[PDB]
Write an enzyme that holds these catalytic residues in place. Structure first.
Site, PDB file in Angstrom:
ATOM      1  N   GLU A  38       0.804  -1.222   0.000  1.00 16.62           N
ATOM      2  CA  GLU A  38       0.000   0.000   0.000  1.00 16.62           C
ATOM      3  C   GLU A  38       0.827   1.256   0.000  1.00 16.62           C
ATOM      4  O   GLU A  38       0.409   2.261  -0.550  1.00 16.62           O
ATOM      5  CB  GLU A  38      -0.885   0.076   1.219  1.00 16.62           C
ATOM      6  CG  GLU A  38      -1.925  -1.012   1.254  1.00 16.62           C
ATOM      7  CD  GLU A  38      -2.863  -0.854   2.407  1.00 16.62           C
ATOM      8  OE1 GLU A  38      -2.751   0.149   3.136  1.00 16.62           O
ATOM      9  OE2 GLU A  38      -3.710  -1.739   2.586  1.00 16.62           O
ATOM     10  N   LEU A  70      -5.514   4.825   1.609  1.00 19.41           N
ATOM     11  CA  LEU A  70      -6.179   3.540   1.434  1.00 19.41           C
ATOM     12  C   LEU A  70      -6.063   2.636   2.626  1.00 19.41           C
ATOM     13  O   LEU A  70      -5.304   2.927   3.481  1.00 19.41           O
ATOM     14  CB  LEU A  70      -5.710   2.826   0.188  1.00 19.41           C
ATOM     15  CG  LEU A  70      -4.349   2.237  -0.012  1.00 19.41           C
ATOM     16  CD1 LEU A  70      -4.454   1.398  -1.245  1.00 19.41           C
ATOM     17  CD2 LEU A  70      -3.351   3.332  -0.248  1.00 19.41           C
ATOM     18  N   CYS A  71      -6.848   1.563   2.651  1.00 18.03           N
ATOM     19  CA  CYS A  71      -6.843   0.626   3.765  1.00 18.03           C
ATOM     20  C   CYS A  71      -7.446   1.296   4.992  1.00 18.03           C
ATOM     21  O   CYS A  71      -8.578   1.778   4.957  1.00 18.03           O
ATOM     22  CB  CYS A  71      -5.419   0.155   4.065  1.00 18.03           C
ATOM     23  SG  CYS A  71      -5.326  -1.383   5.012  1.00 18.03           S
ATOM     24  N   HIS A  72      -6.680   1.320   6.075  1.00 18.91           N
ATOM     25  CA  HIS A  72      -7.103   1.933   7.299  1.00 18.91           C
ATOM     26  C   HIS A  72      -6.628   3.349   7.264  1.00 18.91           C
ATOM     27  O   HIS A  72      -6.989   4.136   8.063  1.00 18.91           O
ATOM     28  CB  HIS A  72      -6.528   1.215   8.473  1.00 18.91           C
ATOM     29  CG  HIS A  72      -7.206  -0.071   8.764  1.00 18.91           C
ATOM     30  ND1 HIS A  72      -6.949  -1.217   8.057  1.00 18.91           N
ATOM     31  CD2 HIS A  72      -8.134  -0.395   9.681  1.00 18.91           C
ATOM     32  CE1 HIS A  72      -7.685  -2.195   8.533  1.00 18.91           C
ATOM     33  NE2 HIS A  72      -8.411  -1.722   9.521  1.00 18.91           N
ATOM     34  N   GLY A  73      -5.796   3.664   6.308  1.00 20.51           N
ATOM     35  CA  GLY A  73      -5.325   5.040   6.099  1.00 20.51           C
ATOM     36  C   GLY A  73      -6.360   6.114   6.406  1.00 20.51           C
ATOM     37  O   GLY A  73      -6.068   7.099   7.095  1.00 20.51           O
TER      38      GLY A  73
END
EC number: 3.1.2.-
Lengths: 286, 287
Positions: free
Chosen positions: A77, A185-188
């Site tokens: 990521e 992105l993701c938990h970003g």
């Protein structure tokens, strides 16, 4: 290869802390990514516009049962989108909230991917000695900043410190006030929770995002021993209670643009978010 | 024969714990602790100790390798055993409220005093207060903190040594007549008093510090460190004008006004004793 343990592996550096299970590493990590080439090799050439990465500096996430998850920023990521950007001609600076070393989830490092590993090697010096984000806000932002966009990669460690920081808040408020990209992105997107700190209304209210889904964190991740315990809150839930449109409920590698907030849903979305970011950034240089 | 090679740390890139050999020499299942000296001596529940603990485990070294370290668990927990047994409660802070990083490989597993103290503090070590929240709400002249305590371990070198929050914390203790208690690499925290100033308020103060000669020499040759420190604590403190009192490691302690130090993990037990006596004596001075 379907006999691998479902139990989390202990991290000997820390008390009551656990890497993801050897089985879960088979289902969620891979020695190679889906990357197959950059679109805009050398498109930008003036050497002025730069990406500002705010990365994770704390590896350990405390869980409901008292055990800790040994995580970090997810490296695909972080490094895949950055391969796209650096190859397009956008240089990168790395910051943490304190200037500490960047913590990766090194158990997800795709050891066989040339593009990611060489990206990691070009970034190593900056990851090991980042800038301090308060020093960035003080000296390197404002209206004439050479930073075109803020990149916040995910992995579970993004949930910690970055989700309740006034320094992250000030950095988001700059990017809105100067029409700059926020890429994440993701938990970003937990980083986005910092915009609504000490405030009745977040200035991201009405923005639409891709977020890692609640249901996976509360169910599947826990049953294959990826996490050794339950998170105390969930990123998609608290983003909703701040008035953001959580546009997905599944993990399909989906990507989304909303004005200049570009987002991805999961690790699967990495390679494409790199293309989106490059594309939209070269579109705003006119 | 134990190997003198640093041992890899799976969690981090190009990072190493101390070599089995160095561990066999510098660590032990037991401490020389042989009892506290003032069980129950302070009985009001007012005065407490503010500990400032390290939250980064990795020190980047001259050669690109990282030392997997943390706070030294003996230097931390033994002095707190003495103080807690004397009746002083303790609150843990870090610079961001991240969990405390201990050198778990130095943890003396067989020592009842140290393990006991660890398990009481577990909750607070894993969820510390944030030092700036503490600065904003719990200092001033009516603080219930009688001392600040900064333990060593090589991790104290990081952050704590260049912090505006640690600086204000030290200003507060000088200006309100509180103790500053530190040992080993912990005194690196005192370099924060000199941030953005020509003259540190701790100028002229005399301290015990882990020696330059051991970090540059013996620690490298037995593979305790996997490479050289980029700077040395005794050296930087001397440059800010503190007087570094020792050139060896022998468990020496010193009191200079309300700054109490020790030179190394060897000093841990005598420093707890020294803090407790000084604090009890200061309480008896105000009546």
């Amino acid at each position: 290869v379907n006999e691998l343990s479902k139990q989390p592996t202990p991290d000997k550096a820390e008390d009551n802390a656990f890497f993801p299970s050897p089985y879960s590493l088979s289902q969620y990590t891979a020695p190679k990514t889906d990357f197959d080439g950059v679109e805009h090799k050398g498109a930008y050439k003036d050497g002025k516009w730069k990406v500002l990465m705010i990365a994770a500096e704390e590896r350990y996430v405390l869980l409901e049962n008292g055990k800790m998850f040994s995580t970090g920023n997810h490296p695909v990521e972080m490094l895949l989108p950055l391969h796209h950007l650096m190859e397009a001609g956008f240089d990168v600076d790395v910051a943490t909230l304190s200037g500490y070393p960047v913590k990766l989830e090194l158990w997800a490092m795709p050891t066989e991917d040339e593009a990611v590993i060489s990206t990691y090697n070009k970034l190593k010096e900056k990851l090991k000695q980042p800038k301090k984000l308060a020093d960035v806000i003080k000296n390197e932002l404002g209206p004439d900043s050479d930073y075109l966009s803020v990149f916040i990669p995910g992995g579970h460690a993004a949930v910690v410190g970055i989700s309740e920081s006034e320094d992250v808040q000030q950095t988001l408020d700059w990017a809105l006030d100067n029409d700059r990209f926020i890429v994440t992105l993701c938990h970003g997107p937990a980083a986005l929770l910092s915009a609504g700190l000490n405030r009745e209304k977040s200035p991201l209210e009405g923005y639409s995002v891709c977020v890692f889904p609640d249901s996976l964190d509360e169910g599947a991740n826990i049953e294959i021993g990826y996490l050794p315990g339950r998170l105390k809150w969930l990123v998609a839930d608290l983003l909703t209670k701040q008035g953001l449109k959580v546009v997905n409920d599944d993990m399909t590698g989906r990507t989304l643009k909303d004005r200049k907030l570009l987002t991805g849903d999961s690790p699967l979305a990495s390679n494409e978010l790199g293309k989106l970011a490059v594309n939209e950034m070269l579109n705003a240089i006119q």
